[PDB]
Amino acid sequence: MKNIAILGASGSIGQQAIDVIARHPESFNLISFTVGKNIEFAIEVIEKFKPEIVSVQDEADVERLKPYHSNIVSGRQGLIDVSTYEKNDLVLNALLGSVGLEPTMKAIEAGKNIALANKETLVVAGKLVMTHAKRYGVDILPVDSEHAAIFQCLNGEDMHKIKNVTITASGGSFRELTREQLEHVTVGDALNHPNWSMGNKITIDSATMMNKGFEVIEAKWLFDLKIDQIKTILHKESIIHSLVEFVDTSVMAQLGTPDMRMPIQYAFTYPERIEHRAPSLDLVQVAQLHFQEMDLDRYRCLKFAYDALRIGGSMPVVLNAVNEVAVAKFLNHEITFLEIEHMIEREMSAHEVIPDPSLEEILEIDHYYKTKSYE
Amino acid sequence: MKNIAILGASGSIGQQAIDVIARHPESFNLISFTVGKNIEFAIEVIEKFKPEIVSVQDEADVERLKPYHSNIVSGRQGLIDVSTYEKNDLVLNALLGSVGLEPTMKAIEAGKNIALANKETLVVAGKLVMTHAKRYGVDILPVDSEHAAIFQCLNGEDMHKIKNVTITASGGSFRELTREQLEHVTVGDALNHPNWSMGNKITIDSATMMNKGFEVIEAKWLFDLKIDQIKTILHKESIIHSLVEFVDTSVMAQLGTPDMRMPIQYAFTYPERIEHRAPSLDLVQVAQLHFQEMDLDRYRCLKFAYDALRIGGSMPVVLNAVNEVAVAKFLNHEITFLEIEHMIEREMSAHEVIPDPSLEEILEIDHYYKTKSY
Numbered sequence A: 001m002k003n004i005a006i007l008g009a010s011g012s013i014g015q016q017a018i019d020v021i022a023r024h025p026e027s028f029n030l031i032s033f034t035v036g037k038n039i040e041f042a043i044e045v046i047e048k049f050k051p052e053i054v055s056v057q058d059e060a061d062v063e064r065l066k067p068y069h070s071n072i073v074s075g076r077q078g079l080i081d082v083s084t085y086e087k088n089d090l091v092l093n094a095l096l097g098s099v100g101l102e103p104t105m106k107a108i109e110a111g112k113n114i115a116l117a118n119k120e121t122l123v124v125a126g127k128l129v130m131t132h133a134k135r136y137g138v139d140i141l142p143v144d145s146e147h148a149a150i151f152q153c154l155n156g157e158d159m160h161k162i163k164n165v166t167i168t169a170s171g172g173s174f175r176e177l178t179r180e181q182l183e184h185v186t187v188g189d190a191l192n193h194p195n196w197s198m199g200n201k202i203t204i205d206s207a208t209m210m211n212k213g214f215e216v217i218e219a220k221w222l223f224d225l226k227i228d229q230i231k232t233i234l235h236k237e238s239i240i241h242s243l244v245e246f247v248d249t250s251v252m253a254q255l256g257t258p259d260m261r262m263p264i265q266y267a268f269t270y271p272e273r274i275e276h277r278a279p280s281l282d283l284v285q286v287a288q289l290h291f292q293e294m295d296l297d298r299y300r301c302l303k304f305a306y307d308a309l310r311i312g313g314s315m316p317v318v319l320n321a322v323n324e325v326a327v328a329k330f331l332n333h334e335i336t337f338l339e340i341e342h343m344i345e346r347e348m349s350a351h352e353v354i355p356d357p358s359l360e361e362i363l364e365i366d367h368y369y370k371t372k373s374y375e
Numbered sequence B: 001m002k003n004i005a006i007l008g009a010s011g012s013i014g015q016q017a018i019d020v021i022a023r024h025p026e027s028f029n030l031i032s033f034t035v036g037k038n039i040e041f042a043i044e045v046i047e048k049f050k051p052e053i054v055s056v057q058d059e060a061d062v063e064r065l066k067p068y069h070s071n072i073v074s075g076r077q078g079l080i081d082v083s084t085y086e087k088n089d090l091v092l093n094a095l096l097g098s099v100g101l102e103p104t105m106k107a108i109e110a111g112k113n114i115a116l117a118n119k120e121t122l123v124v125a126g127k128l129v130m131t132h133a134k135r136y137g138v139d140i141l142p143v144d145s146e147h148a149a150i151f152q153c154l155n156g157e158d159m160h161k162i163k164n165v166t167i168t169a170s171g172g173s174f175r176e177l178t179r180e181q182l183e184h185v186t187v188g189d190a191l192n193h194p195n196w197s198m199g200n201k202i203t204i205d206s207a208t209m210m211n212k213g214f215e216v217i218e219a220k221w222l223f224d225l226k227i228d229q230i231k232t233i234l235h236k237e238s239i240i241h242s243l244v245e246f247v248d249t250s251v252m253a254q255l256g257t258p259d260m261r262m263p264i265q266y267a268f269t270y271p272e273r274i275e276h277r278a279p280s281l282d283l284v285q286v287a288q289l290h291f292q293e294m295d296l297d298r299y300r301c302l303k304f305a306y307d308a309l310r311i312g313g314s315m316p317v318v319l320n321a322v323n324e325v326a327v328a329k330f331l332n333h334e335i336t337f338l339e340i341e342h343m344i345e346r347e348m349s350a351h352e353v354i355p356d357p358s359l360e361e362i363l364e365i366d367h368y369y370k371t372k373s374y
């Protein structure tokens, strides 16, 4: 048996990881998990999976759960408790935004392997989080279409012989608009995403191209690449999930239907793969696959991400913190769509960067930008 | 450092590998090489690399190369001593035809890693060379954009967990035509394809899809496959060279330029890779990749290889030898295009079928069908 911890269990990635657990009672177990605010979901999981400890993200909800369960934690500590439980053999982080940083930190400290779906952990503190993995003898296991993809293409490969990697972008809801028309998009239209869903924050990030920019950074720390090693390309159908090129011009791609359970389960069964009872990718049905050169004028958020990469230090913490606040304000009909872009540029032009932020200053800056006034 | 040996050196592939040796003096030297035919090329290749043993076709030619160094051989035995030169570390078998079979086999026994550029040996002696390769503790690598893909896809994986394999197809010169319009086809419109480069025999195989039939049979033995795996798809751009799917549903693939210096050089370096100075694959310039189902009514030649595979034994040897003569004759205007599909079909249906041939059966069954009357 492997004992699995799910951090973001009430989310898209978390749900899909519970199905995987529900498709393999023989090899997996759900030992601990975390929700936020979807308490009905928690009761369903507790009455099916028999987990030992559950954490809510708000204390008032503890006693809605206390009949069904006895070991109920809550809040900030409730996260570390569920990610550091000693019966944990593997921790899956499906939290969004930097809320997930601190628990993987404390989980690593406890010598526990990490399947990492939470992107911004590596965006705000990649290099901090990696050099912590070495030193505790724990590995970081990507669970994210684009990065699970790169990962499998490197099996039996010397990472030293990578020329570049290319990360594929679907282009989000507004891929067939020019900025001119973007003055006119509603929240409803932004939420109607092409290829996956995945929840609302990822859907807007995908339309902003922040999602890919976050992943170009995550990829720099996973695979130890340079800025010129990271390319992007626009792939409408989202079949090819990424591709790496080696110094001998051989190029490797991984393919699938936009379904997250495969990368999740491989991150549970590495380096063995086991059967996944689901329809296979039928290249004959898809008929054709498109590729267009990335446009950095149409998606300036991907240019900011590159810029947060080449400045370094604490600039990535700001790009993430303000994006978290800009996307929330957009979904609450507080700002317009192109506002997300302009909000981000401001705080970055002003940021006084810290070269090698420790954890506490990273969590500091992130707090400053999430509670600052945007007027 | 590795000392390489090339058997079909005057050949198209043997020369591209000579370049792949010449770009990397830090990793390769050519220690021994074989040539029949072209004696000129030998002298230009002796002067550069000064290798330690040579073979010619005809002992008649032995005399012209006495003055350029000492250790020269010829004939059937000639091929063997350069195959099993104890200074070789990897031996590239580049001579197309039934001549490739025995040299390879003796090189396996001398314990030499083999690079297989001869499509013949694994269509015709698959179970043989493979069981012997496992017997003598040596691996067969592929130069071949198709099988070098599979090799790179499975690198770092448990072959036990393969679902399918899918080799990719361009469809030859007549992809856009129907078997009805191919009553009107000529030898000149058969060769209007990018495979035109040393494709005289290979373009025809591409036009009839014998070419990929041949590689599903090689795949079956090289990667220990069952027939229900090994699928095939029409991919017009020929950028994706092959797909592998695992029991978890994941799908790997290798994509590339149409440059055979790439697999050649990967073959040489097997676990390693190392720098190949050519233009990379720009995916934004080939805007799309197309994918149509394989139609076995439309390419009866492809069913014929799945047929030869379904039976086993000596039946694949009949396929290679007859397709050889039927393709050869079509080019001499002795035979019309659709006949190749018929000429093979008749001989196949009539063939007697030996269950587990040995080398000499295989060689004799090959000779008879190449030289009989049609």
Ligand SMILES: O=CN(O)CCCP(=O)(O)O
Residues within 6 Å of the ligand: A143, A144, A145, A146, A168, A169, A170, A171, A172, A196, A205, A206, A211, A212
């Ligand atoms: O793990 C999945 N994603 O990060 C979403 C990929 C979609 P896109 O590049 O359009 O956002």
Ligand SMILES: O=CN(O)CCCP(=O)(O)O
Residues within 6 Å of the ligand: B144, B145, B146, B168, B169, B170, B171, B172, B195, B202, B206, B211, B212, B238
């Ligand atoms: O061995 C020959 N080839 O790999 C040439 C590929 C062209 P085809 O795709 O139609 O087989």
